[model samples]
Target: DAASDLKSRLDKVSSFHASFTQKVTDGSGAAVQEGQGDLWVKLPNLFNWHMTQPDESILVSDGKTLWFYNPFVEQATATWLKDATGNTPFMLIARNQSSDWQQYNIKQNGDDFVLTPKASNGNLKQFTINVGRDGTIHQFSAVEQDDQRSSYQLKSQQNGAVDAAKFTFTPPQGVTVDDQRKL
Candidate 1:
């Protein structure tokens, strides 16, 4: 029921943009990284994530290819959508189709929903999303197979009218691009 509800809510959104604070913690519960960022996503798999504090990085996807760019290192990596986002929860939601929902085991946990991949050996171990009564996403969290935990608490969220150009990425001048897409 929650899965269907989530799908219904997501289906109504053509685009979403949010400001958030994120933190990553180790297995021992020590915080490893923390930052503030802004994210934009368009339906059927397009997104842009710009991290501003702690470290500067950008991840963008144009529904086909995904790009991860680290300004500090001036290195950009590219990967195909299917290969890069299979284990990414947000991407999964953006690309959500009825068939895609079958690959995950969803359970309602109070005001939160938990999603676990049917396949055991995936990059992600578990995902949790908190939804408000208004159907807005309040928080998102995930635990990796390696025991690293990452969580984001949304500060502000808005839906509708995101610029299409936000989903495309171009490496800046003098940056090295490492294409990791399948041959």
Candidate 2:
């Protein structure tokens, strides 16, 4: 079954929400950043992410748009989900179209699937997702164009239909809106 089974597993995941501890390291494998966050991802494209430690940031998808905000900058970015889907591969995964699955080359070992982008233009270099035992995601990691690797160690994951409001995003007052939806 190989990666085929991997796809079948993803196809069955209706929703997954968890608290994750994020660790990032550079190409030299030296620790760069450490933080924790909560993620609520619902299939067919919707999610909310809140950075809970070290600093503050929020990422949400209101189904149509993906909004990113950082309190340090007090600026929020709004990008059309349709336009961001290719570069933001995590979103593409949750969207889970077979056509999107075709966009990457897959390498597998047991439940671990390493996905490499077929397109050179994308910011994501490659990613690996461990489907864990069955429908649960054990952990996932990705390398960016900069050669920095970021991984999320998920904990206390609950699987089921998540609240729709979890995916809704409303910019907090006083934050400057950088609307890339213009494009």
Candidate 3:
């Protein structure tokens, strides 16, 4: 019953909030840096992830727009969400969990399902996912350009009942928020 309930809800999930840890690595297989953050996502594509503690890292997507904010650089990069393409893994997840997954040859691993990319691409070399049986994503690992690898593990998840406002973020006081307006 638990599995079925989760499966059905995941199919129609509108939003979620969770804590995450990101491990970055270099081409030499050496660990680079690790970041702790929280991710909020809304279905059909909207996500806001903010890393706290060591400085700050922020990523926001509002369906039509994408924003990447770095406090150390005092700059934010913006792009059209639709233009992101297959470059961003989260977009791939939100858009094609039940579909494109077929091509990836998904397999079950304990309580999670793992999916591997079908081919080598410039942006992403490979991908691995650990999604719960109910279809809620739990962890992810990826190799990107320059042979860099990263693993993101979910520390906690608040699925199914995420508030719509959680996916929306506003610039803080005295922060420089850049808008790369569409051409």
Candidate 4:
């Protein structure tokens, strides 16, 4: 029943490769920076994101922790599940709906549903996800109060079989392992 409920809300997605454009706005509604990237994500909590247009940046989450690797500055930040806390959005979608999310209203909007968190005091003041009837993500908008807003719209998606290793990342040799403390 749980899986069915989620599948119904999401778009028909297996393994997807898509291009994404992100716009970050300041509190005053001014554009801060715009970047584009390619996202390769497989089901059950695995994603690899690489920024293409701007500085080279990469983020990967293999269920337990999130890994961020920045090539421009030569820095790597790893945040564990417990430490990540509210910093992760994919974690919410990767896992089944929980009572904690109930505080945020999940309502049906047209062909999709919108989830807006009730509290706007945190880093993520509010977020809206437009999920297709079949459970595919159509749109996402996150507002950090009057400070910043990030929006992502899926331009296209190619569905195909995905290998397990595609989602897993092993730190390359000599790359400093900066765990939670270094972050």
Report the lDDT tens digits of candidate 4 across residue range 1-183: 333444446435756777888888887778988988877776556677778777778887787777888867667888775455444455455443454356465665465555566764345666666666555676676766464788877787677766667576666777777878445
- Residue 72, model 3: lDDT of 88
Per-residue accuracy of model 2 over 1-183 as CA lDDT, tens digit each: 455677678777778788888989997899999999988888888888888789988888888999998989989999998776756546655776676667789888877888888877567888888885467887888888998898888787888888888888788889898998985
lDDT of each: 0.83, 0.81, 0.68, 0.65
Best by the lDDT measure: 1
Which pairs of residues collide in candidate 4? 9-135, 10-134, 10-135, 10-136, 11-134, 11-135, 11-136, 27-146, 27-147
Q: Can you give the TM-score per candidate against the true fold?
A: 0.92, 0.91, 0.77, 0.79
Where does candidate 1 have its weakest 10-residue lDDT segment? 84-93
Looking at model 3, residue 119 earns an lDDT score of 69
**Tens digit of per-residue lDDT, candidate 3, span 42-106:** 77777787888465887788777777888887777777877774566676555544444444545
Q: Please say which candidate is ahead in lDDT: 1 or 2.
A: 1
Candidate 4 — which residues are off by over 4 angstroms? 1-7, 11-14, 119-122, 181-183
Candidate RMSDs in order? 1.6, 1.7, 4.2, 3.6
Q: After superposition, how far is residue 154 of candidate 4 from its true place, in Å?
A: 1.1
> In what order do the candidates fall by TM-score, top score first?
1, 2, 4, 3
Which sections of candidate 1 miss by over 4 Å?
A: none
Best prediction by TM-score: 1
Clashing residue pairs, backbone N/CA/C < 3 A, model 3: none
lDDT of 1 at 11: 73
lDDT of 1 by residue, 88-121 (tens): 7667667767766666799986668888889764
